[PDB]
């Protein structure tokens, strides 16, 4: 099990959850926040949520991973 904090992302309406250790780089484009996350198997994934959908508590975490 992971001992890190997980971040929930509203992927096109779906509720996804990525561990903070899997988050590679987050890039806020303004209203839309895009992020790259490492999944496994050599390949990774990506997503983009809105400022309104992303909770402040998690949004601040995204600020720390803002690369």
């Amino acid at each position: 099990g992971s001992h890190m904090a997980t971040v929930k992302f509203k992927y096109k309406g779906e509720e996804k959850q990525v561990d903070i250790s899997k988050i590679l780089s987050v890039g806020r484009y303004g209203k839309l926040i895009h992020f790259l996350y490492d999944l496994g198997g050599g390949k990774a994934g990506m997503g983009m949520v809105s400022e309104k959908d992303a909770p402040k508590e998690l949004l601040q975490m995204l600020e720390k991973q803002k690369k």
């Binding site: 895009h34 198997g41 990506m46």
Partner: peptide
Amino acid sequence: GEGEEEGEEY
């Protein structure tokens, strides 16, 4: 297999 894509109209 893994590797999704978004598509939001900015």
